[PDB]
Amino acid sequence: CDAFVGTWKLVSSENFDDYMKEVGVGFATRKVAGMAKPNMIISVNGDVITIKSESTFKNTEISFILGQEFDEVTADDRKVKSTITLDGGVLVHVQKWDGKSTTIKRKREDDKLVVECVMKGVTSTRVYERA
Numbered sequence: 001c002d003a004f005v006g007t008w009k010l011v012s013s014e015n016f017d018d019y020m021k022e023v024g025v026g027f028a029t030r031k032v033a034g035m036a037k038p039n040m041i042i043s044v045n046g047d048v049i050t051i052k053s054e055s056t057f058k059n060t061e062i063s064f065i066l067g068q069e070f071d072e073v074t075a076d077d078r079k080v081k082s083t084i085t086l087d088g089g090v091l092v093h094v095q096k097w098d099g100k101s102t103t104i105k106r107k108r109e110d111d112k113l114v115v116e117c118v119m120k121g122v123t124s125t126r127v128y129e130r131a
């Protein structure tokens with residue numbers, strides 16, 4: 001995951017409110033979470049990948065090995081079972097909870113890290129640049 005490692009800052013977000021609605025996030029959390037401009041810090045140590053998100057809304061940190069399911073409490077307080085894999089150089093992060101599923105894809109495009117969050121037919125695209 002060499003191309004992903006570093007410190008990234010959110011610079012643009014499209015359709016994130018609609019994505020959060022589809023996920024089931026409530027009004028007040030959607031409003032405050034949508035304002036946030038997080039710094040995402042990605043690091044690798046051996047087989048272990050760590051993704052931290054620091055923001056004024058809620059700090060999160062996940063560590064994982066590709067292909068190996070883990071427990072995650074999301075920033076909006078869902079308790080989900082997550083599996084992250086690499087698919088053709090794209091990090092694919094599937095979250096399962098309450099019979100529902102959402103997929104977050106992270107990919108390098110030019111000097112940006114593009115995050116696509118998909119819930120059924122609703123996609124949000126969030127673009128990060130190096131800090």
Ligand SMILES: O=C(O)C(F)(F)C(F)(F)C(F)(F)C(F)(F)C(F)(F)C(F)(F)C(F)(F)C(F)(F)C(F)(F)C(F)(F)C(F)(F)C(F)(F)C(F)(F)C(F)(F)C(F)(F)F
Nearest residue numbers: 025033036038053054055057058074075076104115117126
């Ligand atoms: O990283 C991105 O830009 C991304 F946004 F694509 C993403 F994070 F991958 C994500 F939206 F998919 C996700 F993980 F937050 C999530 F899985 F959707 C989620 F579970 F966090 C969520 F989006 F569903 C949420 F929890 F509902 C949320 F609303 F809280 C939030 F907005 F995403 C948020 F809280 F995480 C935040 F506001 F975005 C934040 F700024 F607080 C931050 F946690 F720092 C973060 F943005 F880094 F997430």
